[PDB]
Write an enzyme that holds these catalytic residues in place. Structure first.
Site, PDB file in Angstrom:
ATOM      1  N   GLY A  84       0.791  -1.213   0.000  1.00 34.17           N
ATOM      2  CA  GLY A  84       0.000   0.000   0.000  1.00 34.17           C
ATOM      3  C   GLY A  84       0.826   1.268   0.000  1.00 34.17           C
ATOM      4  N   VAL A 121       4.912   1.047   0.111  1.00 36.11           N
ATOM      5  CA  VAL A 121       5.370  -0.120   0.847  1.00 36.11           C
ATOM      6  C   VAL A 121       5.065  -1.388   0.071  1.00 36.11           C
ATOM      7  CG1 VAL A 121       5.244  -1.430   2.981  1.00 36.11           C
ATOM      8  CG2 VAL A 121       4.983   1.058   3.036  1.00 36.11           C
ATOM      9  N   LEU A 139       3.827  -7.854   8.818  1.00 30.92           N
ATOM     10  CA  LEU A 139       2.668  -8.444   9.501  1.00 30.92           C
ATOM     11  C   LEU A 139       1.552  -8.610   8.469  1.00 30.92           C
ATOM     12  CD1 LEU A 139       4.100  -6.342  11.710  1.00 30.92           C
ATOM     13  CD2 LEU A 139       2.458  -7.506  13.205  1.00 30.92           C
ATOM     14  N   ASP A 158       0.400  10.328  14.316  1.00 28.97           N
ATOM     15  CA  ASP A 158      -0.606   9.996  13.317  1.00 28.97           C
ATOM     16  C   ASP A 158      -1.153   8.594  13.502  1.00 28.97           C
ATOM     17  OD1 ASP A 158      -2.288  10.583  11.241  1.00 28.97           O
ATOM     18  OD2 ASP A 158      -0.872   9.925   9.693  1.00 28.97           O
ATOM     19  N   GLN A 163      -5.231   2.137  10.233  1.00 29.58           N
ATOM     20  CA  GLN A 163      -4.437   1.740   9.066  1.00 29.58           C
ATOM     21  C   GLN A 163      -2.969   1.417   9.377  1.00 29.58           C
ATOM     22  OE1 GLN A 163      -5.493   1.112   5.911  1.00 29.58           O
ATOM     23  NE2 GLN A 163      -3.382   0.512   5.419  1.00 29.58           N
ATOM     24  N   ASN A 164      -2.371   2.123  10.332  1.00 31.22           N
ATOM     25  CA  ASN A 164      -0.999   1.796  10.718  1.00 31.22           C
ATOM     26  C   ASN A 164      -0.871   1.005  12.025  1.00 31.22           C
ATOM     27  OD1 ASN A 164      -1.170   3.890  12.642  1.00 31.22           O
ATOM     28  ND2 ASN A 164      -0.427   5.390  11.136  1.00 31.22           N
TER      29      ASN A 164
END
Ligand SMILES: CC[C@H](CO)Nc1nc(NCc2ccccc2)c2[nH]nc(C(C)C)c2n1
Length: 288
Positions: free
Chosen positions: A12, A19, A81, A125, A129-130
């Protein structure tokens, strides 16, 4: 240099670069490879900061395996992961993530945060998503300390109000706010504050927690982007905001969403909250 890695597939678009899932040709390990995105040559402070980050190791922080400053480019090699929490939440929409799993995840992230914060490192942030998960029930923070290393539609949903109101210097409290938003979202299956602009984000916060004033948040009316002309919303009771979160959970959440950053509960104090009295480490239901 990069010849050592074989692209497997695009994972993504990150904040600071694309990445890819990749394989190390020499060791055979599969990793997550990030290419950092004015091209003149990696700044010296970016290099020192990231090198600092390599030493900040914790079970709940995605491991930074290698920093590859080559040919005037920067690649970061990270632990891989299999899934992120946004995808897992979407996947779990029909039934919701079981409370024991929510608690376990919140508990682990609070551990990761406590560790980073004890080293004076902020995330800045935090968002589903992270946040990354594996099959053994672990949750890990990705992109930690990257914001500092490099100074950058982006999601606003998890952004602390002091940031929105123009505060120039973030504190560890901004991460607690974000995690609090994510906590509520796992429980209710709805994003807490889904803003689509900075003012919409702010106004959605104001409408739920009440428009902040000097009583609840001293110095607030003096912030760069504060306007006397802001609408005056009354606060709403949490029993209405996050059912079926129990009394312990709602008490903890309220402390994570305090307006005044200096009053907002720390990661370390949150770990001692009665909400975590019966914490356990269940396994997620993952099909990959
Ligand atoms: C794109 C950035 C974000 C968080 O860094 N994603 C994202 N997603 C992953 N895995 C989930 C996934 C697996 C297979 C396909 C798609 C997603 C990751 N594993 N390791 C990393 C580091 C770069 C932090 C990572 N980042």
């Amino acid at each position: 240099g990069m010849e050592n890695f074989q692209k497997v597939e695009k994972i993504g678009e990150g904040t600071y670069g694309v990445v890819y899932k990749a394989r190390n040709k020499l060791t055979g390990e599969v990793v997550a490879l990030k290419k950092i995105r004015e091209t003149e040559g990696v700044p010296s402070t970016a290099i020192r900061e990231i090198s600092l980050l390599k030493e900040l190791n914790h079970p709940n922080i995605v491991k930074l395996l290698d920093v590859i400053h080559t040919e005037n480019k920067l690649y970061l090699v990270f632990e891989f992961l299999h899934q992120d929490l946004k995808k897992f939440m979407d996947a779990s929409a029909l039934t919701g993530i079981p409370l024991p799993l929510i608690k376990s995840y919140l508990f682990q992230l609070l551990q990761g945060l406590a560790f980073c914060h004890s080293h004076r490192v902020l995330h800045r942030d935090l968002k589903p998503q992270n946040l990354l998960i594996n099959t053994e029930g672990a949750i890990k923070l990705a992109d930690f300390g990257l914001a500092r290393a490099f100074g950058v539609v982006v999601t606003l949903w998890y952004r602390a109000p002091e940031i929105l109101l123009g505060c120039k210097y973030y504190s560890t409290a901004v991460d607690i706010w974000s995690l609090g938003c994510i906590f509520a979202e796992m429980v209710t299956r709805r994003a807490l504050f889904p803003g689509d602009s900075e003012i919409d984000q702010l106004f959605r916060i104001f409408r739920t927690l009440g428009t902040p004033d000097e009583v609840v948040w001293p110095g607030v009316t003096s912030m760069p982007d504060y306007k006397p002309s802001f609408p005056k919303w009354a606060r709403q009771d949490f029993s209405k905001v996050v059912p079926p979160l129990d009394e312990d959970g709602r008490s903890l959440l309220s402390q994570m969403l305090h307006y005044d950053p200096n009053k907002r509960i720390s990661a370390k104090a949150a770990l001692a909250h009665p909400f975590f009295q019966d914490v356990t480490k269940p396994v997620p239901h993952l099909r990959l």
